Amino acid sequence: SPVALYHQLKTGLHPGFGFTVVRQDRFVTENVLFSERASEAYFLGQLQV
Amino acid sequence: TKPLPTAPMAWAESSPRELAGHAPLRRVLRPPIARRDTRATRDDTEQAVDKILRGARRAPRYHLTRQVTLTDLCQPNAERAGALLLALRHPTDLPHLARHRAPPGRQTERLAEAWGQLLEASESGCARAGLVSFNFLVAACTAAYDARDAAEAVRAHITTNYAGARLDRFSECLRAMVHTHVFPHEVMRFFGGLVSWVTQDELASVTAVCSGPQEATHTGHPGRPCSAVTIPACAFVDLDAELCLGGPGAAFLYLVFTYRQCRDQELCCVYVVKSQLPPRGLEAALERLFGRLRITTCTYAAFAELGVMPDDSPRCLHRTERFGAVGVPVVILEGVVWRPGGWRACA
Amino acid sequence: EDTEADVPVTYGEMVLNGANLVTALVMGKAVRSLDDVGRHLLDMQEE
Amino acid sequence: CFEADIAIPSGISRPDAAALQRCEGRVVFLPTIRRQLALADVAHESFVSGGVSPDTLGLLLAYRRRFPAVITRVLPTRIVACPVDLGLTHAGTVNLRNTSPVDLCNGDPVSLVPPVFEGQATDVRLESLDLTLRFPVPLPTPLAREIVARLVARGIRDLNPDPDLNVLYYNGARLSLVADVQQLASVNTELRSLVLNMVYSITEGTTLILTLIPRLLALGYVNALLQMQSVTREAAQLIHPEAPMLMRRLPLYEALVAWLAHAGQLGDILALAPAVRVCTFDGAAVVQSGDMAPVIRYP
Amino acid sequence: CFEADIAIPSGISRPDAAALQRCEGRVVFLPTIRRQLALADVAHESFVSGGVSPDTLGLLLAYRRRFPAVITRVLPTRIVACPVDLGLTHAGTVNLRNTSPVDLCNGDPVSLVPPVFEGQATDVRLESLDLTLRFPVPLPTPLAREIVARLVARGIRDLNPDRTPGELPDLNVLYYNGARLSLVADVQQLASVNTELRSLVLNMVYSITEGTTLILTLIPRLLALSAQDGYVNALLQMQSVTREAAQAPMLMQDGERRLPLYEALVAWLAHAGQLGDILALAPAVRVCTFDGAAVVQSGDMAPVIRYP
Amino acid sequence: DGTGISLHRQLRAIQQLARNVQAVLGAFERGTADQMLHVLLEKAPPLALLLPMQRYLDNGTRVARATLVAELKRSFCDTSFFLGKAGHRREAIEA
Amino acid sequence: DVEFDALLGSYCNTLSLVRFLELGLSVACVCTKFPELAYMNEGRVQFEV
Amino acid sequence: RDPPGYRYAAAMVPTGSILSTIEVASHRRLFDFFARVRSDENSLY
């Protein structure tokens, strides 16, 4: 029972099964972009205010 | 013809940023991004087209609502330049609802008979009847509410211009409505100020101000060849002027229905209160000044805010206008701005 | 590193200024450089 | 007017582009008043909160938190909607579309959640870009409040059940609430969460005053005035509820706090404050269902 | 925009005039709708009732009466504030300076509050002319209604006066997001707590009708849901009287066509539903940001638009 | 006003406005480049995945896809952060 | 006595204006100024390989 | 979405050259319209 397992886990018993831990983990990278010579067409519209 | 102190009149006797606006923006070309390195008739036609010129050269303190109704109730001609018109909505519920929201011990058949009777007294087709005038309420409840003959002077106005039957039939409806928990409010919301009627036969097309200031309307001495303009309370009987004690602030204008629930047998009181209190403070002052709380449910008054009179002082009281032979205490209210507001009565 | 300065260009531009409007409005669609396209098109079937 | 231009996504099917063309005059709620907004931000898939599509309560929350803007012109590759909240009051007349009852010459339409009426009817799906739009129904404030309360009551009866609230007579013809079928089962399942917050806030309100009044006035002018006008009303209701119910100043006061908040949160959700009014002119004065109606920004 | 000018009297020391320069965007309560006004009508010395400064439940009743005005600009001899209760009609959105630990979000209705936090800075003493200015704290109505409830109950429970031991619950501490918020517990005045109690008691009574008894039947049914749904489980707060209230039709139907359920909702919704509003001042403004910034940091200027 | 001050304030007016315009017109200069990146990054595969892909795109198939993906799975683990991993040796970098 | 207070200097700076044609990115694109995009809903390019 | 067809005949005067040579089927999906014509189809005339 989930109440029983509070007593086991806090008091340090192994409740007959075990877990797998999963963490979402982030970083900050640095990249190199390469682009071919005419890699896009970029039409430009008129400017409005 | 020119002053001594010139700077104050160039502004008085009478933009460049929009000119400077198009200047950087519009004058600039291909931006942005950058690369490195027939006497009278003729005159009239021309002027109408031109008027379309100026009005189409440009483009808010005014709103006009327009509607077509009958002259049975209401009636624009009897009324004048400044007047309160109240809308009336959905005659279809000849107490159909009376079935519900009507407490037991109530012969909810009263409205259907009172009201259907009103119709017999005064079918659906070309038009419908909306637009109750402020006037027509003052007379209908005149004998009901507290002051008589200042109040009945208004009743003499309507019988001789607008029928005592309809007043009596409509009074029977107000009694029957206040009886069965369908109130005169939750009916009769504010419509406007009555700019110009344009009636034909039994028909009327009433223009009137949804909101905005009154005095700035058709204006003139009077609107059309009638008389002046004003929002004259029409009663020295109405125009309950609060602020018995006061300081300068914009006066405010509300619309209150007071009722009698067996204390007087479903009394209808309709009048206007003019004092500087923001609706959250009017409910308090309406609790006072009133002993009409007779349970003898507990829903004594219901109020909505018409608008502002952003000047305290124009409150003229005049028992001096003729809407035909009859004379009425008339209180003139100088300048008014209309905020329609909403109906709040919970208790 | 083979050089510092280089020689780059300037902006390309396209408008609907000719018979390319008459199509923009009446059939209601455009093709880039009709005058070329159309001419290089028409010119082929007379030869 | 301050138009805000919603950007249609990439290529959409020709039948979808004709679906949008028919959406001019419909109310949109836009999360922020940024001049440039996406279509996905407006679409009903953007109302998801707890991982689910919102119920009628979750909607009414959102309708009170984002900005409704009527659609003025729908253009291929743009939707132009002018927010109702911005600018001066009584200005920027923009046309609506009437749905259901007439919308007479005034009355301040409220935009209430769609499920209250035919549920999926008005979903307006766009398959090409895989999104959907549920447009609120523009009903007058007196009728909008009558309805939303009318359905909650039906819900309460339904909660435990063993005079028809459904038939509605509005104007010329009796309006119909029930679409019968299982629509009610779909309507009642979405009001499920609104009904409870209503049932709770009542049962938690009474029991909290019925405990407080007898656990107050027994510890001045409080006592006399209270029992004075409460004769056979509060006290009678006290004996009667305590008859068919059970009965702590410390939990009392801390529960009076948590109720007082939850209560006013429902008064905010509920009461459907009007977004706009109808003020017509040179117009019919009654807008027949499905017809564009003039409308102005403040009641 | 019907702006109300407010004349700075005489000379307030260059240090005092520098204090008013940063008061733009703050809120003022003026006891009228005017065009000409004196600086001293706005000051906290005007809030003083006969002989006595109102407490912090007394101010709410004073801010109930008079009109909130947000200062737009401050000139050498006048202060320009446009009275939101009236002159809110601007095309775009007057700036409100967020003064609070809190943060607005977008769309949050903003109701004001007397300064009420444990750590606060609302003194603004101006020594040249005797007067001061307490600026109200803007705050989301969800939070401002939680606070008023705290002040009301604290003034009330103390008033019983709790018989039970001398250690009562907190009621002085909130949470908005994270950030424990500790209210100021200082004085409670008879008259200020009476009216707040009087109108609380009064309205919770009118929300009880005949059809209400039909709802009280459903308490045992609620607790059936307390326990078999995860919602409805959450709904019932742990400290729920209702939970303790369960620890019925009564026939008496008057002809059977009234629909007391519907009528009971309407009745409750009016009186009890609108309690934040009657106990405190209701929102008249809501945050709106055109630039698309979706919050307002504390201390920033919140673009604000008319009523929610 | 006839004043030396009101003129001077108007000078500040014309002046600050000119600064703002110079800035926003240069934004569309800055932003056209910043936007150019995003549309390149949005269409650019990570190289770790692109190398193994290419050599299966010109060959001539379910097992070839299984053999493909199992191999992308490895090459991504290995050669991502290559300059951080292998950056101490030339021919590995230069290749 | 006299005690004065001085401004010993004022210092401004200059924004740099970047063209986007002086960069190395403008090779990655064929830019062209198309005055009315607001009038064209769907543009296409064709490839026959 | 029923992609609007390829407009042969506009391609009768191409505006440029494609410098890749690849079987484009792999990349199929990145195009709005695509055909694979073997030798000739009736629908090009």
Side-chain angles (χ1 to χ4, degrees), chain A, chain B residues 3 5-8 10 12 14 16 20-21 23-24 28 30-35 38 40-41 44-45 47-71 73-78 81-88 90-98 102-108 110-112 114-121 123-127 129-141 143-145 147 150-151 153-167 169-171 173-185 187-199 203-214 216-223 225-235 237-259 261-262 264-282 284-285 289-304 306-312 314-317 323-333 335-338 340-343 345-347, chain C residues 1-12 14-46, chain D residues 1-2 4 6-13 15-23 25-34 36-40 42-54 56-63 65-72 74-84 86-107 109-117 119-122 124-126 128-129 131-145 147-157 159-161 163 165-173 175-179 181 184-214 216-218 220 224 235-236 241 243-244 248-249 251-253 255-267 269-281 283-290 292-299, chain E residues 1-2 4 6-13 15 17-23 25-34 36-40 42-44 46-54 56-64 66-72 74-84 86-117 119 121-122 124-126 128-129 131-145 147-157 159-162 164-169 171-185 187-195 197-209 211-228 230-236 240-243 245-246 248-250 254-255 257-262 264-276 278-290 292-299 301-308, chain F residues 1-28 30-41 43-95, chain G residues 1-2 4-21 23-47 49, chain H residues 3-22 24-28 30-40 42-45:
Chain A
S1 63
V3 175
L5 273 68
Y6 176 75
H7 299 296
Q8 300 173 331
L9 295 176
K10 301 301 284 188
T11 310
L13 187 144
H14 185 76
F17 59 88
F19 298 92
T20 179
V21 182
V22 172
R23 72 172 64 194
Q24 182 65 261
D25 186 70
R26 189 178 178 86
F27 295 91
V28 173
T29 70
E30 292 179 349
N31 295 340
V32 289
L33 181 46
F34 177 82
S35 179
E36 202 64 70
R37 177 179 147 299
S39 189
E40 216 103 3
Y42 201 73
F43 316 72
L44 275 66
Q46 209 154 36
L47 180 264
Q48 293 177 335
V49 191
Chain B
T6 56
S14 63
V28 292
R30 226 189 326 272
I33 217 69
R35 317 152 158 184
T38 37
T41 42
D44 140 300
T45 160
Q47 28 209 50
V49 180
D50 254 63
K51 189 139 196 299
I52 288 156
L53 292 174
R54 292 172 294 176
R57 297 292 179 271
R58 182 176 65 85
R61 62 180 295 175
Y62 176 77
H63 187 279
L64 295 174
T65 59
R66 176 149 204 308
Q67 165 145 345
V68 169
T69 53
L70 289 170
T71 56
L73 292 199
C74 197
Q75 186 173 355
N77 320 102
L84 281 71
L85 297 172
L86 313 138
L88 166 79
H90 296 301
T92 300
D93 293 35
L94 282 65
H96 167 298
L97 205 139
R106 312 285 209 176
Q107 26 175 320
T108 62
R110 185 177 178 174
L111 277 168
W115 190 261
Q117 262 277 301
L118 157 43
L119 220 192
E120 236 107 3
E123 330 180 58
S124 58
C126 321
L131 295 174
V132 193
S133 39
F134 176 61
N135 277 323
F136 192 88
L137 284 178
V138 176
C141 297
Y145 86 58
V154 176
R155 186 178 180 85
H157 173 206
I158 293 173
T159 61
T160 60
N161 289 341
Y162 293 80
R166 290 176 298 182
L167 284 172
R169 300 290 183 270
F170 185 85
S171 297
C173 298
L174 295 173
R175 301 295 183 85
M177 284 188 284
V178 181
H179 179 59
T180 90
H181 282 221
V182 174
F183 294 98
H185 78 245
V187 198
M188 286 148 28
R189 185 182 295 276
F190 197 65
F191 185 82
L194 203 147
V195 174
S196 36
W197 35 108
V198 191
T199 86
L203 292 171
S205 64
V206 180
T207 65
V209 183
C210 271
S211 61
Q214 180 65 255
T217 70
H218 182 62
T219 56
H221 203 114
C226 270
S227 59
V229 162
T230 295
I231 306 96
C234 295
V237 186
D238 296 342
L239 177 63
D240 210 8
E242 195 166 1
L243 311 176
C244 321
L245 349 64
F252 284 86
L253 316 160
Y254 303 95
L255 191 45
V256 180
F257 279 19
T258 38
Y259 314 124
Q261 293 177 335
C262 262
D264 210 307
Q265 294 295 110
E266 290 91 1
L267 190 66
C268 59
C269 311
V270 175
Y271 58 84
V272 174
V273 302
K274 198 213 97 170
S275 76
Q276 70 285 0
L277 323 165
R280 54 189 180 276
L282 185 72
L289 191 144
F290 271 58
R292 263 87 181 238
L293 270 137
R294 330 309 4 156
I295 285 112
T296 274
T297 78
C298 292
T299 177
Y300 66 136
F303 72 89
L306 314 181
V308 175
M309 166 137 132
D311 305 345
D312 61 356
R315 75 154 309 307
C316 309
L317 298 165
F323 311 71
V326 213
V328 203
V330 90
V331 160
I332 284 174
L333 294 173
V336 168
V337 169
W338 300 106
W343 270 122
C346 298
Chain C
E1 185 277 334
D2 182 67
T3 304
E4 295 83 358
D6 61 355
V7 175
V9 317
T10 277
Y11 273 111
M14 79 152 282
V15 296
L16 305 183
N17 216 86
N20 199 15
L21 288 170
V22 175
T23 62
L25 325 154
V26 71
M27 252 94 90
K29 62 181 64 180
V31 174
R32 183 177 181 173
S33 67
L34 286 176
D35 289 344
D36 291 344
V37 164
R39 180 177 65 82
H40 298 292
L41 186 32
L42 192 31
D43 66 356
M44 288 187 286
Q45 64 180 21
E46 292 90 359
Chain D
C1 205
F2 181 88
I6 299 165
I8 304 295
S10 64
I12 61 173
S13 66
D16 288 346
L20 295 174
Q21 295 296 109
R22 294 173 293 180
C23 292
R26 300 289 182 89
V27 177
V28 148
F29 296 79
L30 51 85
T32 58
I33 299 100
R34 179 184 302 277
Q36 187 215 128
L37 291 137
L39 191 146
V42 158
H44 187 273
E45 294 81 0
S46 64
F47 297 164
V48 175
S49 65
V52 294
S53 175
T56 55
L57 178 65
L59 286 176
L60 291 172
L61 288 169
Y63 292 78
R65 160 61 61 109
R66 71 171 65 199
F67 313 77
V70 181
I71 294 169
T72 57
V74 296
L75 294 148
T77 58
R78 264 185 78 221
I79 295 176
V80 174
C82 174
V84 169
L86 291 174
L88 62 80
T89 59
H90 300 291
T93 303
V94 63
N95 279 228
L96 284 181
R97 290 179 65 82
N98 188 24
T99 301
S100 210
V102 175
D103 282 350
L104 273 80
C105 184
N106 289 285
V110 178
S111 303
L112 43 73
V113 305
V116 56
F117 295 102
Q120 294 329 257
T122 210
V124 175
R125 184 174 181 80
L126 300 175
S128 177
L129 45 78
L131 289 174
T132 294
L133 297 173
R134 295 176 66 186
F135 297 100
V137 175
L139 295 177
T141 56
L143 176 136
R145 295 182 183 173
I147 286 184
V148 62
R150 183 60 58 86
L151 277 57
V152 51
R154 174 174 84 186
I156 307 276
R157 292 179 180 168
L159 209 47
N160 181 303
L165 292 172
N166 307 18
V167 267
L168 260 171
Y169 268 73
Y170 206 61
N171 185 334
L175 147 59
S176 64
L177 194 23
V178 165
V181 66
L184 275 63
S186 66
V187 172
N188 290 283
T189 189
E190 292 174 349
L191 276 68
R192 175 80 174 80
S193 62
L194 188 149
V195 170
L196 300 170
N197 290 280
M198 188 62 186
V199 177
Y200 175 71
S201 183
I202 295 175
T203 62
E204 180 67 9
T206 63
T207 63
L208 191 145
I209 186 175
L210 297 180
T211 185
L212 178 64
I213 302 302
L216 177 301
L217 295 49
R248 293 180 182 178
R249 286 178 189 175
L252 187 31
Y253 297 139
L256 188 146
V257 170
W259 181 83
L260 195 150
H262 186 277
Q265 297 292 101
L266 290 174
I269 296 165
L270 291 182
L272 295 174
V276 193
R277 289 177 66 85
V278 177
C279 176
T280 60
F281 178 84
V286 172
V287 179
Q288 311 266 313
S289 182
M292 291 275 191
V295 175
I296 64 179
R297 158 171 323 110
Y298 153 87
Chain E
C1 182
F2 186 87
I6 298 168
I8 288 103
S10 164
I12 53 172
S13 40
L20 289 180
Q21 293 302 320
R22 60 180 67 92
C23 291
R26 293 178 181 273
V27 180
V28 153
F29 293 97
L30 47 117
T32 34
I33 295 299
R34 290 280 185 78
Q36 179 204 49
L37 188 30
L39 177 63
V42 168
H44 188 278
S46 64
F47 290 144
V48 173
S49 60
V52 292
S53 164
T56 166
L57 269 209
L59 286 175
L60 285 173
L61 298 173
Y63 306 171
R64 175 62 63 87
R66 322 178 175 215
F67 322 82
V70 173
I71 281 62
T72 59
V74 175
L75 313 196
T77 51
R78 288 149 45 196
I79 293 170
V80 178
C82 193
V84 170
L86 172 63
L88 190 53
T89 43
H90 320 244
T93 84
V94 80
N95 267 345
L96 177 63
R97 185 176 179 83
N98 180 24
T99 299
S100 62
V102 193
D103 184 1
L104 311 185
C105 304
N106 212 17
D108 289 343
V110 171
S111 59
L112 306 165
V113 167
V116 73
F117 288 107
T122 305
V124 57
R125 176 64 178 169
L126 303 174
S128 304
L129 295 174
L131 295 174
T132 47
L133 298 172
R134 289 186 184 172
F135 297 101
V137 173
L139 292 174
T141 51
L143 184 148
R145 290 178 179 172
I147 286 173
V148 175
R150 300 298 181 91
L151 295 174
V152 169
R154 183 171 66 87
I156 294 188
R157 179 202 57 177
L159 158 154
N160 272 145
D162 289 345
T164 61
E167 294 171 348
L168 290 45
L171 291 184
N172 205 33
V173 174
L174 285 73
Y175 295 88
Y176 182 84
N177 298 337
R180 168 190 171 273
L181 299 175
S182 63
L183 301 184
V184 173
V187 66
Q188 220 93 350
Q189 279 156 318
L190 271 305
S192 64
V193 175
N194 289 337
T195 54
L197 184 149
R198 181 181 182 276
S199 63
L200 186 150
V201 169
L202 184 67
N203 289 334
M204 295 180 72
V205 171
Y206 290 104
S207 61
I208 301 169
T209 56
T212 302
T213 301
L214 276 64
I215 289 101
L216 275 304
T217 303
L218 274 58
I219 290 176
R221 181 73 181 91
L222 284 177
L223 298 180
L225 299 171
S226 181
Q228 59 214 24
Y231 184 80
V232 195
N233 183 67
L235 177 63
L236 299 166
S240 209
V241 113
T242 295
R243 289 186 182 275
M250 298 331 278
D254 222 331
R257 187 176 58 80
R258 56 175 181 180
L259 289 35
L261 285 174
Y262 170 77
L265 303 177
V266 176
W268 180 94
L269 191 148
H271 300 281
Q274 316 177 9
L275 259 178
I278 66 97
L279 289 160
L281 318 78
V285 124
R286 181 177 181 170
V287 196
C288 183
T289 70
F290 296 104
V295 294
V296 174
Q297 297 298 103
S298 61
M301 295 290 289
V304 141
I305 79 201
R306 190 167 295 100
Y307 172 88
Chain F
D1 271 328
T3 307
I5 291 169
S6 66
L7 284 45
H8 185 277
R9 295 178 65 191
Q10 185 175 356
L11 270 306
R12 296 185 185 173
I14 296 169
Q15 284 173 342
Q16 185 66 58
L17 185 33
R19 291 181 179 87
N20 295 132
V21 173
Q22 295 298 322
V24 296
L25 294 176
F28 296 92
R30 303 289 184 92
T32 185
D34 177 66
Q35 189 179 357
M36 184 63 58
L37 271 67
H38 294 83
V39 304
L40 294 175
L41 288 64
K43 67 181 178 189
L47 187 50
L49 299 179
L50 190 150
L51 294 176
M53 184 66 75
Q54 293 303 323
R55 63 180 63 94
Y56 294 81
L57 261 58
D58 53 347
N59 59 347
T61 301
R62 188 184 182 187
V63 170
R65 171 173 178 155
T67 301
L68 171 65
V69 53
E71 185 275 340
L72 287 63
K73 189 174 171 190
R74 296 287 296 177
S75 68
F76 178 84
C77 187
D78 292 347
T79 62
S80 57
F81 302 106
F82 180 81
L83 189 35
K85 294 178 67 60
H88 60 284
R89 54 180 186 174
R90 298 295 301 277
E91 296 84 356
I93 305 298
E94 293 177 351
Chain G
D1 59 354
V2 62
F4 59 83
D5 186 3
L7 290 176
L8 275 310
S10 296
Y11 296 94
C12 189
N13 63 28
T14 57
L15 271 67
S16 64
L17 304 156
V18 306
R19 286 329 202 70
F20 179 85
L21 287 198
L23 297 177
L25 291 168
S26 53
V27 70
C29 53
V30 182
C31 299
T32 182
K33 294 179 178 176
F34 179 72
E36 66 286 6
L37 290 163
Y39 296 112
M40 67 174 282
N41 51 321
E42 158 151 19
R44 283 168 236 74
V45 300
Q46 317 203 286
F47 308 95
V49 298
Chain H
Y6 178 86
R7 181 66 61 184
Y8 318 92
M12 199 165 176
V13 285
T15 62
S17 297
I18 296 168
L19 296 174
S20 294
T21 57
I22 57 172
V24 282
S26 328
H27 293 288
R28 171 63 176 80
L30 66 84
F31 302 105
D32 178 67
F33 176 83
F34 177 90
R36 187 179 174 274
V37 172
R38 230 197 296 194
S39 185
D40 220 324
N42 195 338
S43 64
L44 289 54
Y45 301 127

